[PDB]
Design a protein around this nucleic acid. Structure first.
Ligand SMILES: Nc1ncnc2c1ncn2[C@H]1C[C@H](O)[C@@H](COP(=O)(O)NP(=O)(O)OP(=O)(O)O)O1
Ligand SMILES: [Mg+2]
Ligand SMILES: [Mg+2]
Length: 427
DNA sequence: ATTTTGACGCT
DNA sequence: AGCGTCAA
């Protein structure tokens, strides 16, 4: 009772851009706005591969990883924007730069953890304390939460905005605004700040986003997706038993792969809430000490992973697949594509050094061989001493060249090349 | 022929 | 170090 931790110490938000690459292209090209639209990479093979889909297009069944030719069968009027191609490969610079726009706005409000190209976690605990001091017991108006859903409410009129407002009203009517240590009040103030953040993002970039507000990263991430697009969702500690009672295990971040499948198989359960019926030692016995403790706390809504102070990526990488009959089968091919990758990498590294006062010191070279189901077949490192594309490509070849069984020829043919600059030091 | 990334874990 | 997992 009085010594049971409840995981209510922090206010954490997750902000994730809505159909991000599509919005970047729609800002640039007004003809694409408010249309069924997708972003594709490459075009020769089946029209290209879709990597982002507007919500209008999702209504037709268009999804990521679909070939555009196949998406056009579902949505004949689908509009397409193509990823830039430079040096023979897709180049994501436009979206990285748009990401920086958004991350720099968010960083004005609080320390952020860049979690992907289009999302960041925010630790709002201190900002909420400050705002609560400023508010001096004044109640929080629903007008301050115009796009917020309270998960689990209303409980106890047939249109969606009416439901949202009814739930928000029940929540606010129940708040105890005279207790500055109240976790529910802290989350509510967090949601007010996130409304302000999302308004600033939209005003200053044109991009819309969704957000989750809760007490930790996992719940914030889960909350964000509950009411996408262009809305934010507050998941309180008290909402967790009902929310988790029908929540498939695979929906929780880090449980969407083999571990989550093993939880389901070994324990014979389906939903996150069912995990509460195992001891911490039972869970550690099946899934290891770290995983077992994490699962024991997480199924009760408790997680302690900190929002890390890091808004810049830790690595800068360049990769290209060579599928099917395009797999590289000659030495000259391997060297030419290593040079293309190294030239893009040099451009990005030079910009990074100027912008961010740091230098990479290690070059990682990865390759996939034809037939291997693993993303990487072989990874080798060497020193990155000069931002020089010819030197980087020559070193990468030196480091991988003895994987060739025999040849001028390369066997088995290479289905992927990957260069990654790592181990940054201040400069 | 689901591509191009990027973080973190294990041994 | 090099390989594996999970993820957007
Ligand atoms: N598997 C993949 N391969 C390549 N790029 C990918 C990708 N998954 C995502 N991207 C790129 C393209 C995506 O636009 C961007 C952000 O990914 P999301 O946040 O998962 N999806 P979005 O923002 O589009 O939609 P919403 O969040 O509203 O559901 O990252
Ligand atoms: Mg997104
Ligand atoms: Mg995302």
């Amino acid at each position: 009772g009085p010594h049971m931790a409840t995981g209510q110490d922090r206010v954490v938000a997750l902000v994730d851009m809505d159909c991000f690459f599509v919005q970047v292209e729609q800002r640039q090209n007004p003809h694409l706005r408010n249309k069924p639209c997708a972003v594709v990479q490459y075009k020769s093979w089946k029209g290209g591969g879709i990597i982002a889909v507007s919500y209008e297009a999702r209504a037709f069944g268009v999804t990521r990883s679909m070939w555009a030719d196949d998406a056009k069968k579902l949505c004949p009027d689908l509009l397409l924007a193509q990823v830039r191609e430079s040096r023979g490969k897709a180049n994501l610079t436009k979206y990285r730069e748009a990401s920086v726009e958004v991350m720099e706005i968010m960083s004005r409000f609080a320390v952020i953890e860049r979690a992907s190209i289009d999302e960041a976690y925010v630790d709002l605990t201190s900002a909420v304390q400050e705002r609560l001091q400023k508010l001096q017991g004044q109640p929080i108006s629903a007008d301050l939460l115009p796009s917020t859903y309270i998960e689990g409410l209303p409980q106890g009129t047939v249109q969606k905005e009416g439901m949202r407002k009814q739930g928000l009203f029940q929540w606010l009517d129940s708040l105890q605004i005279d207790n500055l240590t109240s976790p529910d009040l802290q989350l509510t103030v967090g949601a007010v700040i996130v409304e302000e953040m999302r308004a600033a993002i939209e005003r200053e970039t044109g991009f819309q986003c969704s957000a989750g507000i809760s007490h930790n990263k996992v719940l914030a991430k889960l909350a964000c997706g509950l009411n996408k697009p262009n809305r934010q969702t507050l998941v309180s500690h008290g909402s967790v038993p009902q929310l988790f009672s029908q929540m498939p295990i695979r929906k929780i971040r880090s449980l969407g792969g083999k571990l989550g499948a093993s939880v389901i198989e070994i324990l014979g359960i389906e939903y996150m809430g069912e995990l509460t019926q195992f001891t911490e030692s039972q869970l550690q016995s099946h899934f290891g000490e770290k995983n077992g403790s994490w699962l024991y706390a997480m199924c009760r809504g408790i997680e302690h992973d900190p929002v890390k102070p890091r808004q810049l990526p830790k690595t800068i990488g360049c990769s290209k697949n060579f599928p099917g009959k395009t797999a590289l089968a000659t030495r000259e091919q391997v060297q030419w594509w290593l040079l293309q990758l190294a030239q893009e990498l040099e451009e990005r590294l030079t910009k990074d050094r100027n912008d961010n006062d740091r230098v990479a010191t290690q070059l990682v070279v990865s390759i996939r061989v034809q037939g291997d189901k693993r993303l990487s077949s072989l990874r080798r490192c060497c020193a990155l001493t000069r931002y020089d594309a010819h030197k980087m490509s020559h070193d990468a070849f030196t480091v991988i060249k003895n994987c060739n069984t025999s040849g001028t020829e390369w066997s088995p043919p290479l289905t992927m090349l990957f260069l990654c600059a790592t181990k940054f030091s201040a400069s």
